[PDB]
Amino acid sequence: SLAYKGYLIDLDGTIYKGKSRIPAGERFIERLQEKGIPYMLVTNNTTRTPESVQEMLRGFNVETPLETIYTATMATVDYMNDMNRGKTAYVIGEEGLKKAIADAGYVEDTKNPAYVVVGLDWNVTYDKLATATLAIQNGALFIGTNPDLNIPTERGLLPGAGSLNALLEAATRIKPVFIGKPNAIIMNKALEILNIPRNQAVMVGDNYLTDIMAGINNDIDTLLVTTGFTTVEEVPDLPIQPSYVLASLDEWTFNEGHHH
Amino acid sequence: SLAYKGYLIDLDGTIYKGKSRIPAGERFIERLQEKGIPYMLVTNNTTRTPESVQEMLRGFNVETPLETIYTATMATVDYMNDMNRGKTAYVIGEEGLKKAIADAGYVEDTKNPAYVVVGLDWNVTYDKLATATLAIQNGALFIGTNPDLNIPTERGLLPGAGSLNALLEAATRIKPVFIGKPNAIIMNKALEILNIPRNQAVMVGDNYLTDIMAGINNDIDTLLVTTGFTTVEEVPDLPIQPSYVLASLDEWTFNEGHHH
Amino acid sequence: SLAYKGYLIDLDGTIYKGKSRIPAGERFIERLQEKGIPYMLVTNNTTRTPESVQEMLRGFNVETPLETIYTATMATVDYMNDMNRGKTAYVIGEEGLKKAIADAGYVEDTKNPAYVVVGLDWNVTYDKLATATLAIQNGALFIGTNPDLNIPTERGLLPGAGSLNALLEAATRIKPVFIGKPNAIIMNKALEILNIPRNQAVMVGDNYLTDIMAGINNDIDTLLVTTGFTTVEEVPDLPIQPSYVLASLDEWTFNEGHHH
Amino acid sequence: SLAYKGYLIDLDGTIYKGKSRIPAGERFIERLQEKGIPYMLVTNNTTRTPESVQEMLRGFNVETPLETIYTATMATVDYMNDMNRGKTAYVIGEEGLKKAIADAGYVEDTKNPAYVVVGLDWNVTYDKLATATLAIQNGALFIGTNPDLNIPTERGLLPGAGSLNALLEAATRIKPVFIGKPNAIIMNKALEILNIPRNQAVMVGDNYLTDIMAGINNDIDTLLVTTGFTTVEEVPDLPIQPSYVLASLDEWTFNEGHHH
Ligand code: NA
Ligand code: NA
Ligand code: NA
Ligand code: NA
């Protein structure tokens, strides 16, 4: 009857919601901190530095150590460093991702790069896509930062990183190695930093396809909170139920545990 | 032992090859004309008017009546007119396609168009893709002009119309109605203009996935000539052999026929 | 303002429903007959001879000439005869399909058949699937009779012909040529027998994915009647609306027409 | 310049080949043992107990502790125990898999089982497939033991577990959680038993799509030995090269390491 010993937690839709608060999300982090329970904040977003995420969270009454924040950009860089294929890349994405990759020592090579890395680019163009296509055809290791097919905006549900990757997969017949949730690489790396065994951890989030499938596919218990992307109405028809479903994180006691 | 009574024929790779001649292709049309055998020239290209195709072919010693030329742009417009969903559209593509659609009376509606039509756009942008995504989500009838995943260029095999459509299918979960070869709509419409029964026609081309599958999927005999996209080396491993495989159209006698 | 000149019409779910009547379906055929309007009854079912369909329909007060009935089995045989690849086949399916193929002169070849043909087999086995896999790998022309993923039964929605084909596509990497609705081959052949131009015909049925997509994908107007597979509640969320949606075929006047 | 500290190693195609020896594979294990380097033998096969694998390996001059053997059956049971959805299952597979699941306390429930588990069944039938389909539709957690599309036999490349899963995915629209290589679950669990950090481990095998993609997708260095499924000729066209490619395991020194 041991309680969970560590937490992996989504941000947008869970701890805050766009520009709006989720006060129970703020209290969830507050309570983790008061109890001394380790956690990681795990996001597919590739546009912010961890410093920027940390500062943004202060506006929602969350003061979290820098080292608790783990983004798909960090995991992408970490994977590139591990695979050790060479310090050249061609990148499609926002400045945050491009700067992280360049800061890690990867220099732009538009023709024979070791890596082609593709995240959301709000200003993607045919020519960027053609450049990536040829580079992939020429043998670069093709990485997608995150598989999300859409990104919610004030305009509506626009194409996400996963849709841009879909164009290149169609054009090259090469499937990208996707780093972000629900895939293994970001989960393994976040678990490593958490330094708690997988069977003592819980993944907490609002998004069934990224957060909850992250737990199902990687064998980690799951807490779905219905404050974000996955609506209350959608829960009954989920093919695989999460370990827990909550309307508010205030319902969580921290006494919950695996097989407990 | 009746010879084929009509021909459906690809252009680039078959009658000419980019800026270069295929002299036996020119002689194939010459011989059709001398024998009085009806034919259509059927292309997935969406960037030229039939007038432009006709003029271009003169440079390769081919003088063909305007009415022999049938492009994926024409078939797209014809399909839109038939389906009669309304005279509004949002189009991704080159000027040739956009002008044809506007000339047909479709006015641009970026929000609630009856149709979203997607062909190759050498200058596609995130914002054009986002606009199409929302319009499709809002209920527009989503049409792809042609399914080709790539387009050959001097640079290499770049993303084609089919790859741009792939991004939108990923972002919307809606599969486009593809008009161009090897799909039925362009084939039915070309056959209609040809005015010869399907079982008395042959589809002639260089490209297995567009021309030869056009015949296999639509039940029309096929002549593969290995002067273009599908190489001589690839022929043995084709999953379904064409009705005929030729190294040069000069080998064709016009005495060939169905079950003959 | 010309009325439609010919009809293509689904059976189960439209003219009758399993063992139960749809009286307005019976009256639809009665009215067609009284008005002298040509029609075809077009079904993906591969288990009955057209004689058997004709006799069964008598129990639902429908007396229809034998030549009005066109099944996926007939269209499969017709396609095999047209493609003229040789009088050998390996077949997965029920006795009705196997007998039709043998009656057409195709002899069983388990190793090097010209054709592999796959429909629903209520008693499919690993060994039949392995036999078909090897035969396809060896170069046989792989045909699926109909693409339906499921078949409704008293037990529930069981795997259909399309699901059996899916196993073989996975095992061989070869996609079958699917004959049945909504694909072109059965539609072209039914239209040929109907002998009415495509733009003067309407496809009538209860099943969006087979009957209504048959019209959308092949450019034929569509009448969805909500007495069968596609429910009234599902209509608003259809990606492409049918030309007409009716709760009962009694609402149809026969004065309806294309662009009319 | 630290050498790898642990090994994950495929069996058939790597340590032996069907009924035939790979003597350098036997010497690879001998050398690991002499050097005291920990290893796991990781296989997608679901038909043998680890005792049976251990006995079989003795015939190839390999004496390995029982605890070094980790199969897709073990990992499937482990995952079912972890997910803790209930002690009922419906299983498609061979007796080895069925016995392991029953030994773990899962009782057969053909209607409302907590789990549906699908591996290769040499005698699969329509009725077993229909039973699984309904059980999945009814909400069971659908698990595929291993994703391999084919299984090599004396007859040829027959349908594998992944192809049987493909039928059920088509019939249900539910994708299985695949346990076996190259998926994360079997890799994480083997790594756990190995008790060596991921970045100090190497995955060794003959099969690009299962063993080498296991390393690429899960961020573990890879040794491809060309004695089995992936041929020497196929190596140049691999989309992502392994960390090492060897013609014989005799070329490996055990001085090789990560970034070393
Ligand atoms: Na979220
Ligand atoms: Na061509
Ligand atoms: Na029906
Ligand atoms: Na192997």
> What's the alpha-carbon Rg for chain B, to the nearest Å?
18
CA C229–ligand 3 middle distance (angstroms) = 7
Compute the distance between CA of residue C255 and CA of residue C259 in angstroms, rounded to an integer. 12
Q: Which of B115, B209, B119 is nearest to B162 (CA)?
A: B119
Q: How far does the CA of residue C80 sit from the closest CA of chain B (Å)?
A: 10
Q: Which residue has the tokens 């010993």?
A: A5
In this structure, the strands spanning D69-71 and D39-43 are parallel
Instruction: Give A-chain residues touching B168 at CB under 8 angstroms.
Output: 159, 163
Question: Would you give the end-to-end CA distance of chain B in angstroms?
Answer: 4
Is D219 marked active-site?
no
HSE-up of residue C258 (Cα within 13 Å, Cβ side): 18
Q: What is the DSSP letter of B211?
A: I
Are A159 and A113 found together in one domain? yes
Are C78 and C94 found together in one domain? no
Angle at which helices C126-137 and C161-172 pack, to 10 degrees?
50
Work out the number of other CB atoms within 10 angstroms of the CB of residue A236. Answer: 8
Are B92 and B158 found together in one domain? yes
B12 touches B62 (CB < 8 A)? no
Instruction: Give C-chain residues touching D150 at CB under 8 angstroms.
Output: 171
Boundary residue ending a domain (D179, D210, D236):
D179
Sheet with C201-205, strands from edge to edge, namely C69-71, C39-43, C6-9, C201-205, C221-225, C244-246
B38 touches B29 (CB < 8 A)? no
User: Torsion angle of alpha carbons B41, B47, B52, B58, nearest 10°?
Assistant: -60
Which residues form the domain of A127? 84-179
Compute the distance between CA of residue B193 and CA of residue B201 in angstroms, rounded to an integer. 12
Cα torsion angle, D187, D190, D193, D198, sign: negative
Q: Nearest Cβ partner of B188 from C84, C139, C219?
A: C219
Instruction: Give C-chain residues touching D134 at CB under 8 angstroms.
Output: 155-156, 158
Judged by CB atoms closer than 8 Å, whether chains meet at B159 and A166 is answered as no
B82 and C CB contact within 8 Å: yes
Cβ-Cβ contacts under 8 Å for D22 (sequence gap 6 or more): D14, D15, D16, D227, D249
C-alpha distances in angstroms, A185 versus A179, A208, B107? 5, 18, 47
Amino acid at site C202 = V
Judged by CB atoms closer than 8 Å, whether chains meet at A167 and B167 is answered as yes
3-state secondary structure (DSSP) of residue C135: helix
Q: Residue C32 — φ and ψ, nearest 5°?
A: -55, -45
Beta bridge partners of A115: A89, A141
Compute the distance between CA of residue C17 and CA of residue C10 in angstroms, rounded to an integer. 11
What six digits make up the tokens of B199?
A: 């079982």
Which helix (DSSP H) or strand (DSSP E) does residue D26 occupy? Answer: helix D23-35
Give the method used: X-ray
D219 and A CB contact within 8 Å: yes
**CB-neighbour burial class of residue A179 (10 A; exposed 0-12, middle 13-18, buried 19+):** buried
Compute the distance between CA of residue C238 and CA of residue A15 in angstroms, rounded to an integer. 35
Q: What is the DSSP letter of A51?
A: H
Which helix (DSSP H) or strand (DSSP E) does residue D42 occupy? Answer: strand D39-43
What six digits make up the tokens of C68?
A: 């009005």
Q: Nearest Cβ partner of B122 from A126, A157, A159?
A: A126
Q: Residue D157 — φ and ψ, nearest 5°?
A: -90, 95
Which residues surround the ion ligand 4 when the cut-off is CB under 5 Å? D 10, 12-13, 206-207, 228
C-alpha distances in angstroms, D213 versus A178, C245, D240? 13, 49, 9
A229 touches A12 (CB < 8 A)? no
C88 touches C114 (CB < 8 A)? yes
**CB-neighbour burial class of residue D195 (10 A; exposed 0-12, middle 13-18, buried 19+):** exposed
3-state secondary structure (DSSP) of residue A222: strand
Are A241 and A207 found together in one domain? yes
Are C162 and C195 found together in one domain? no
3-state secondary structure (DSSP) of residue A46: coil
In this structure, the strands spanning D244-246 and D221-225 are parallel
Are A167 and A108 found together in one domain? yes
> What's the alpha-carbon Rg for chain D, to the nearest Å?
18
Q: Nearest Cβ partner of B150 from A157, A169, A171?
A: A171
**Conformation bin of residue D5: beta by default, left when phi > 0, alpha when psi is -120 to 50:** alpha
C-alpha distances in angstroms, D249 versus D32, D205, D237? 12, 10, 22
Compute the distance between CA of residue D58 and CA of residue D61 in angstroms, rounded to an integer. 5
Cβ-Cβ contacts under 8 Å for C57 (sequence gap 6 or more): C11, C15, C16, C41, C63, C64
Compute the distance between CA of residue B184 and CA of residue B166 in angstroms, rounded to an integer. 19
In this structure, the strands spanning C141-144 and C177-178 are parallel
Which helix (DSSP H) or strand (DSSP E) does residue D222 occupy? Answer: strand D221-225
3-state secondary structure (DSSP) of residue C43: strand
Are A92 and A132 found together in one domain? yes
* Residue spans of alpha helices (H) in C116-212: 126-137, 161-172, 184-194
Amino acid at site C16 = Y
Cβ-Cβ contacts under 8 Å for C58 (sequence gap 6 or more): none
C-alpha distances in angstroms, B28 versus A25, B3, B38, B249? 73, 15, 12, 6
Cα torsion angle, A121, A122, A128, A129, sign: positive
- B10, B78, B211, B221: the catalytic one is B10
Which helix (DSSP H) or strand (DSSP E) does residue B144 occupy? Answer: strand B141-144
CA D138–ligand 1 middle distance (angstroms) = 28
Judged by CB atoms closer than 8 Å, whether chains meet at D134 and C156 is answered as yes
Amino acid at site C196 = I
Answer whether C touches D (≥3 Cβ pairs < 8 Å). yes
Compute the distance between CA of residue B144 and CA of residue B88 in angstroms, rounded to an integer. 16
B177 touches B207 (CB < 8 A)? no
CATH number for position D236: 3.40.50.1000
Q: What is the DSSP letter of B3?
A: P
D214 touches A175 (CB < 8 A)? no
Q: Which residue has the tokens 């021309």?
A: B211
Compute the distance between CA of residue D11 and CA of residue D28 in angstroms, rounded to an integer. 12
Boundary residue ending a domain (B179, B207, B230):
B179
Residue B182: asked if its preceding bond is cis (omega within 30°), the reply is yes
Q: Residue C212 — φ and ψ, nearest 5°?
A: -75, -45
Boundary residue ending a domain (B179, B206, B231):
B179
Letter string b/e over residues B207-232, b meaning 16 or more CB atoms within 10 A of that residue's CB: bbebbbbbbbbbbbbbbbbbbbbbee
C206 touches C228 (CB < 8 A)? yes
Q: Which of C228, C226, C227 is nearest to C244 (CA)?
A: C226
HSE-up of residue D226 (Cα within 13 Å, Cβ side): 14
Total number of domains constituting chain D: 2
Which helix (DSSP H) or strand (DSSP E) does residue C92 occupy? Answer: strand C88-92
Q: How far is CA D230 from the centre of its chain?
A: 16
Instruction: Give D-chain residues touching C131 at CB under 8 angstroms.
Output: none
**For chain B, how many residues are written?**
260
Q: Residue D208 — φ and ψ, nearest 5°?
A: -60, -50
D131 touches D58 (CB < 8 A)? no
B8 touches B192 (CB < 8 A)? no
C143 touches C183 (CB < 8 A)? no
What six digits make up the tokens of A75?
A: 């995991």
Which helix (DSSP H) or strand (DSSP E) does residue B179 occupy? Answer: none
A136 touches A116 (CB < 8 A)? yes
What six digits make up the tokens of A163?
A: 């849709």
Is C181 marked as a binding-site residue?
yes
Are C66 and C191 found together in one domain? yes
Are B92 and B167 found together in one domain? yes
**For chain D, how many residues are written?**
260
D217 and A CB contact within 8 Å: yes
Nearest-by-CA chain D residue for A179: D217
Compute the distance between CA of residue C30 and CA of residue C13 in angstroms, rounded to an integer. 17
Compute the distance between CA of residue C96 and CA of residue C48 in angstroms, rounded to an integer. 6
3-state secondary structure (DSSP) of residue C52: helix
Amino acid at site C115 = Y
C-alpha distances in angstroms, B47 versus A145, B94, B166, C11, D36? 34, 6, 20, 44, 67
Task: Please count the helices (runs of H) and the strands (runs of E) in chain C.
Answer: 8, 15
CA C11–ligand 3 middle distance (angstroms) = 6
Q: Which of A176, A175, A201 is nearest to A188 (CA)?
A: A201
Compute the distance between CA of residue C105 and CA of residue B37 in angstroms, rounded to an integer. 34
HSE-up of residue A145 (Cα within 13 Å, Cβ side): 29
Judged by CB atoms closer than 8 Å, whether chains meet at A158 and B134 is answered as yes
Compute the distance between CA of residue D201 and CA of residue D256 in angstroms, rounded to an integer. 11
Beta bridge partners of C204: C9, C223
Are D227 and D209 found together in one domain? yes
Q: Nearest Cβ partner of C159 from D160, D162, D171?
A: D171
Which helix (DSSP H) or strand (DSSP E) does residue D16 occupy? Answer: strand D16-17
Compute the distance between CA of residue A110 and CA of residue A121 in angstroms, rounded to an integer. 17
What six digits make up the tokens of B75?
A: 């078939």
What six digits make up the tokens of A219?
A: 């064998």
Q: What is the DSSP letter of B226?
A: T
3-state secondary structure (DSSP) of residue A186: helix
In sequence order, what DSSP letters do the residues of A121-179 get, joined into one string? -TT-BHHHHHHHHHHHHTT-EEEES---SEEEETTEEEE-HHHHHHHHHHHHS---EE-
CA angle A97, A99, A104 (to 5 degrees): 100
Q: What is the DSSP letter of A86?
A: -
Which helix (DSSP H) or strand (DSSP E) does residue B27 occupy? Answer: helix B23-35
Compute the distance between CA of residue D54 and CA of residue B193 in angstroms, rounded to an integer. 71
B224 touches B236 (CB < 8 A)? no
3-state secondary structure (DSSP) of residue C235: helix
* Residue spans of alpha helices (H) in D124-183: 126-137, 161-172
> What's the alpha-carbon Rg for chain A, to the nearest Å?
18
D16 touches D41 (CB < 8 A)? no
Compute the distance between CA of residue D27 and CA of residue D249 in angstroms, rounded to an integer. 8
Is D10 marked active-site?
yes
Nearest-by-CA chain B residue for C136: B239
Are A163 and A88 found together in one domain? yes
**CB-neighbour burial class of residue A101 (10 A; exposed 0-12, middle 13-18, buried 19+):** buried
Compute the distance between CA of residue A114 and CA of residue A133 in angstroms, rounded to an integer. 14
Work out the number of other CB atoms within 10 angstroms of the CB of residue D84. Answer: 12
Are B66 and B100 found together in one domain? no
In sequence order, what DSSP letters do the residues of C8-27 get, joined into one string? EE--BTTTEETTEE-HHHHH
In this structure, the strands spanning C88-92 and C115-118 are parallel
In this structure, the strands spanning A20-21 and A16-17 are antiparallel
Q: How far is CA D214 from the centre of its chain?
A: 10
Compute the distance between CA of residue D51 and CA of residue A143 in angstroms, rounded to an integer. 40
